[PDB]
Amino acid sequence: SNPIVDYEFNQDQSCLIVSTPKSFDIYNVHPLKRIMSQEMPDAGTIRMLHRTNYIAFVSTKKELLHIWDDVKKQDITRVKLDAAVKDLFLSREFIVVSQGDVISIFKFGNPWNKITEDIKFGGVCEFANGLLVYSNEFNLGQIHVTRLQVGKGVLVKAHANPVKMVRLNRKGDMVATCSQDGTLIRVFQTDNGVLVREFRRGLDRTSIIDMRWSPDGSKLAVVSDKWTLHVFEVFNEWSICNFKLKVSKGSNDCKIAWISDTGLVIVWPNRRLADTFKLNYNDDEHVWWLQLNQRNEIP
Structure with missing residues (x-):
């Protein structure tokens, strides 16, 4: 009866965290077992920090980003958001939030403040292991690759058509890319943006x-x-x-x-x-x- 509102894996993908209208639960992926469950209404998009007790969810109603402590069973802080969340990422250092037309970067830990000026982008992004990737706000085929030390980094003309999504590998030295066509899947080095490989999914166009x-x-x-x-x-x-x-x-x-x-x-x-x-x-x-x-x- 309970529908899944949002779901996402942790960084190593050993856990699956989901939110329902009535609660949010965490599961082992393999073997599939529920680790915990917490009664919680109005929980929107929800993320998890590795296998720690640190959980982050967005309140659909009040437009707030909570940082929930899983053992204390209470909020650590709440962060005010100005638009609808599209993506969310967690590390031991940073909170990367994609709200509307913008990417915001807060600190993970007191005072939980913004570390840099907000970055306007093209609609797709990824953050993993201190490495941020996002599409240019006007050149949708391009992607910026930067290391949060923010500072500037590498720009890559990934595709002719607008980039649909992006995926960093486990280490963070490679990025996979695709477009609306979904015909070609390119792989670049995060060091210098050089094309490592180019795969062909199929002849016909599909959304990935x-x-x-x-x-x-x-x-x-x-x-x-x-x-x-x-x-x-x-x-x-x-x-x-x-x-x-x-x-x-x-x-x-x-x-x-x-x-x-x-x-x-x-x-x-x-x-x-x-x-x-x-x-x-x-x-x-x-x-x-x-x-x-x-x-x-x-x-």
Whole structure:
């Protein structure tokens, strides 16, 4: 009966945090088990800091960004927001918030203040391991890559068409990119913006639902609105794997999570469902293939 309002993984993707109209819960991804649950109305977008007790959620009603203490069971602080949140990221140092046309950067810890002037951007962004990536506010095909020390950094003409989404690897030395076409998936070095690789998802155009690097950064998982799961070798050219995902009509969004160097989990918000995949390899024939092992309710 409880619908999922928002859901997201933690930085290593060992946890899944979700918000409902009545509460917000945290789960292990593999094995799928609920770690905790907290009665909480009006909880909007919600994020989690690693495997600590530090939780951040946005109040839909009062337009407030809370920092919730999971053991104290109370607010640490509340931050006033001026527009609707689009993205949210947490590190031990910074709180990166994407509200409206702007990216705001607060400090993680007292006094919980803004560290820099607000950055206007193109609508897509990513922050991971102190490394910020966002699209230029007018040149939507371009992306800025900067290290929060903010200061200036590298500019990359990623695509002709506007960039749709972006994904940093686990270390933070590479960024995967795609567009509205969803035909080409490019990989750049965060050091200098040089094109490392260029993948081809397919001939026809599709919207890309999610991307995610493997833990070692050797592989890149991709899911399109065609609802096909792709896997590309980096290896640090077409996909080495394909799998027609099992989707119903109500499904229109999901998120990928690597549980190992050879295991993925696809979380389905509307169906409240988690598909566990194994990435198999035949050393004799030098071929990869995907296998759907388990299908679990959240609950």
